[PDB]
Amino acid sequence: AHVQKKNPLKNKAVLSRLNPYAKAYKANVKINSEKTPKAAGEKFLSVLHEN
Amino acid sequence: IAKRAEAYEAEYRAAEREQIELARKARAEGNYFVPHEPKLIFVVRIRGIN
Amino acid sequence: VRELIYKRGFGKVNKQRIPLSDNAIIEAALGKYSILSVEDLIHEIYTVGP
Amino acid sequence: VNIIKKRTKPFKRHQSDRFKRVGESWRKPRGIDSCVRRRFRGTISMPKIGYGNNKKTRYCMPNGLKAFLVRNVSDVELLLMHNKTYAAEIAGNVSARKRVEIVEKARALGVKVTNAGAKVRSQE
RNA sequence: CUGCCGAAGUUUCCGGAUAGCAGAAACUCAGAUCAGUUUUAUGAGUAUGUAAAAUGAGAGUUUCUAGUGGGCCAUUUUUGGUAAGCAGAACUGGCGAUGCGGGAUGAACCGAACGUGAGGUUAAGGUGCCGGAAUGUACGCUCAUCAGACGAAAAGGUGUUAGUUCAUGAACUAGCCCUGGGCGCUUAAGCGUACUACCCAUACCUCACCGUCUGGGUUAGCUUUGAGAAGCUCAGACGAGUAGGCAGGCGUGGAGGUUUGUGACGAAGCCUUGGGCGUGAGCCUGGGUCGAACAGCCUCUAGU
RNA sequence: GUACGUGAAAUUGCUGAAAGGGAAGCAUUGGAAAUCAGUCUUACCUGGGUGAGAUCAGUAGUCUCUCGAGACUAUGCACUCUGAACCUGUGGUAGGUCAGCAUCAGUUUUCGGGGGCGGAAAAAGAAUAAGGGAAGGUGGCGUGUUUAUAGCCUUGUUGUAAUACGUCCACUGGGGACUGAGGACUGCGGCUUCGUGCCAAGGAUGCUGACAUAAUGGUUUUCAAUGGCCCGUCUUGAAACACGGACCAAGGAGUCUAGCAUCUAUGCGAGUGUUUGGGUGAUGAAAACCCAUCCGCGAAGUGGGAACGCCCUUGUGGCGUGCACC
């Protein structure tokens, strides 16, 4: 048993064996849009742009 | 395992988003955010046995 | 953490370096702690569980 | 499992070429100051267990067979079940009369003979 | 011949009894302890110590039983110093039993500690040529007619580069230049800094193989037959080595047994740029020479 | 061929080949030259024809073993069998070194395409716009100006952004190199309505090409590149140094024995030990075999291994060897 070690990051068949979740993963989800509320008050900006 | 693995990944994403949102509100409002100090560390030995 | 346990992941089984090629290897050694897979092992390591 | 030799050169005794009184049969150097025992750079190699050959291919001739020493027709018939694993090698002191009898018997058994042409002539 | 284990190189009294280091045997023992380790806080005086937390490892033994009873390189702390060096304690490790990459070369400097190999990647050092690798990028100093690359030293510099202070100047500060491995190099192939590329160790990774150690499997011996159970099989880790210890083997003379063994159709020996086997001691074999005896296996023996 | 069996090494002469310039021999890797080794397609399968014979006879006898098992002897060649001989096939498959490619698996190196998420939700910038100054532009008179017939900076500000950097994708497309351990089946998985199903899932397979008078490698001599000190002893910190060594062959050093102790094996066991001696041994008789009387030595509370019965199991209860505690 286990004559050869196969890398789950390269062998996709070994990955499905070890992780029964990679089938439904959906890595790149989109959470941003064209209404991004830039959040940096004038107090913080003044401190940052100080001296 | 499929349900547990899915739960773990959602936990990581929620925690990562929580840090981003909390820092965003601290930056915008005016105070400062101090995230939790690390609890897990990876050590690599770089010197030989001599 | 995730890639280390996958590519370079080995477990101490009967004082032997047995690679974690199957979830049954992890369960047979950490089943008493409700760790049954590599993702449970990753979750325990990354989040520093009990 | 093809035959692999970790080394083909022999291990010659140190200073065996310099002196005719010193044979080339390997002798482990005992001098503490000797650079060969200390295994310096450029010096000759020493027999180590790492040089040992594969157990499966050990004792195997380049054709994959193991030499089995044979002195009469009784020894050839022994390789009936092992003609794919062993080759018959007639001893050096077996006369040319017995060598002929061995060679004909080995031919029917399908047994390779390493020195089947020694001490004999052919006449077709 | 190979394999495995492996020191001490010095406390204490005083040629030894020791101890200690390294092995064997007889044990018991994880619901237990141990540690060239860090802690918690308070006890005492940041250090030091404490009982009970973290990390790692299963540990404690009792008996006897080989070898050693020095030094060197020195570092550091450190005492006295004394023209000045230097010497004196402890401490620290290394060399001593240790090969390898670098250091132009190198017994003690920088890396790294070793089974046989393939591939990859590095360390210390390096990439003008010798020499494997950018005559790479960016920003600066210097032109040395004794450059630089590795005390005559105080100063002198109508030698400078930048800056600081006071303020037309004055000095000051810091750094380069002068006076006091080879070839060659000069907006460098020198020096300083930053940044990517690249070179390669016996080191690191992956794989194969050798061996040792450790753990596991294997009998109503199942048509998987793989029960020389002293066999077969699975797995993981490891590999320097002096003294010393322990295993397994190779070879020689003779003896008991055995091969219903080899031999004048050529024994033994010898020669040979013939062939093969074994990590090795060694063994088998072709040809030549030669002319009467000789060998394998099990055991015994020794003027081996 | 009496300088006489075999005829080693050191050493010498001649001949042949090769290399020559000073540490050298030697080690590693290949070239060249010389030489050598083994590996071959041949068989297998199938069909018919012809004859054959026995382990075949809707067959007769003998022998040896334990009805039938072997060996034969006659007689037949169909019924079966003999891949049996040959003709017929010109049927079909065809084994060892090299080489090439393709599908893969392991390791690794090297370019590229996208997509999320972070930062001042990048900063800039294009761009809406108010003001100001000069490295004063343009006008005005080198001096001073404030957009003129350039514009610059600052500021809020125009629809939002984009990009860079960091990070992630169980997103994706190529190139190169090394490796192929194992050897029926099991297992974990993915596809698949299910599948003696298929698969990149407990380690390489498939498709081809070249050669026997050759291909491929080995050996020897030499060359090239890289490295490389002379051993043994003694010394001391390792050294160094000083000792031994012209060469070759043969000989040449922990042996035998008497005690003692340890460990192991073997026999017997409160015993044990035949061999001072006697008996005996017909064939070799210094052996082996047998033993009368003496004698030597020896002797005269807990923990806990293992097992039983209960307890879902742990655990409890009864019973404890050896040894250490009491």
Swiss-Prot record, chain A:
<comment type="function">
    <text>Component of the ribosome, a large ribonucleoprotein complex responsible for the synthesis of proteins in the cell. The small ribosomal subunit (SSU) binds messenger RNAs (mRNAs) and translates the encoded message by selecting cognate aminoacyl-transfer RNA (tRNA) molecules. The large subunit (LSU) contains the ribosomal catalytic site termed the peptidyl transferase center (PTC), which catalyzes the formation of peptide bonds, thereby polymerizing the amino acids delivered by tRNAs into a polypeptide chain.</text>
</comment>
<comment type="similarity">
    <text>Belongs to the universal ribosomal protein uL4 family.</text>
</comment>
<comment type="subunit">
    <text>Component of the large ribosomal subunit (LSU). Mature yeast ribosomes consist of a small (40S) and a large (60S) subunit. The 40S small subunit contains 1 molecule of ribosomal RNA (18S rRNA) and at least 33 different proteins. The large 60S subunit contains 3 rRNA molecules (25S, 5.8S and 5S rRNA) and at least 46 different proteins. uL4 is associated with the polypeptide exit tunnel. uL4 interacts with its chaperone ACL4 and the nuclear import receptor KAP104.</text>
</comment>
<protein>
    <recommendedName>
        <fullName>Large ribosomal subunit protein uL4B</fullName>
    </recommendedName>
</protein>
<feature type="region of interest" description="C-terminal-extended nuclear localization signal">
    <location>
        <begin position="1"/>
        <end position="51"/>
    </location>
</feature>
Curated annotation (Swiss-Prot), chain C:
<protein>
    <recommendedName>
        <fullName>Large ribosomal subunit protein uL30B</fullName>
    </recommendedName>
</protein>
<comment type="function">
    <text>Component of the ribosome, a large ribonucleoprotein complex responsible for the synthesis of proteins in the cell. The small ribosomal subunit (SSU) binds messenger RNAs (mRNAs) and translates the encoded message by selecting cognate aminoacyl-transfer RNA (tRNA) molecules. The large subunit (LSU) contains the ribosomal catalytic site termed the peptidyl transferase center (PTC), which catalyzes the formation of peptide bonds, thereby polymerizing the amino acids delivered by tRNAs into a polypeptide chain.</text>
</comment>
<comment type="similarity">
    <text>Belongs to the universal ribosomal protein uL30 family.</text>
</comment>
<comment type="subunit">
    <text>Component of the large ribosomal subunit (LSU). Mature yeast ribosomes consist of a small (40S) and a large (60S) subunit. The 40S small subunit contains 1 molecule of ribosomal RNA (18S rRNA) and at least 33 different proteins. The large 60S subunit contains 3 rRNA molecules (25S, 5.8S and 5S rRNA) and at least 46 different proteins.</text>
</comment>
UniProtKB/Swiss-Prot annotation, chain D:
<keyword id="KW-0597">Phosphoprotein</keyword>
<comment type="similarity">
    <text>Belongs to the eukaryotic ribosomal protein eL32 family.</text>
</comment>
<keyword id="KW-0963">Cytoplasm</keyword>
<dbReference type="InterPro" id="IPR001515">
    <property type="entry name" value="Ribosomal_eL32"/>
</dbReference>
<feature type="modified residue" description="Phosphoserine">
    <location>
        <position position="74"/>
    </location>
</feature>
<dbReference type="GO" id="GO:0003735">
    <property type="term" value="F:structural constituent of ribosome"/>
</dbReference>
<dbReference type="Pfam" id="PF01655">
    <property type="entry name" value="Ribosomal_L32e"/>
</dbReference>
<dbReference type="InterPro" id="IPR036351">
    <property type="entry name" value="Ribosomal_eL32_sf"/>
</dbReference>
<dbReference type="GO" id="GO:0002181">
    <property type="term" value="P:cytoplasmic translation"/>
</dbReference>
<dbReference type="InterPro" id="IPR018263">
    <property type="entry name" value="Ribosomal_eL32_CS"/>
</dbReference>
<dbReference type="GO" id="GO:0030684">
    <property type="term" value="C:preribosome"/>
</dbReference>
<comment type="function">
    <text>Component of the ribosome, a large ribonucleoprotein complex responsible for the synthesis of proteins in the cell. The small ribosomal subunit (SSU) binds messenger RNAs (mRNAs) and translates the encoded message by selecting cognate aminoacyl-transfer RNA (tRNA) molecules. The large subunit (LSU) contains the ribosomal catalytic site termed the peptidyl transferase center (PTC), which catalyzes the formation of peptide bonds, thereby polymerizing the amino acids delivered by tRNAs into a polypeptide chain.</text>
</comment>
<keyword id="KW-0539">Nucleus</keyword>
<protein>
    <recommendedName>
        <fullName>Large ribosomal subunit protein eL32A</fullName>
    </recommendedName>
</protein>
<keyword id="KW-0689">Ribosomal protein</keyword>
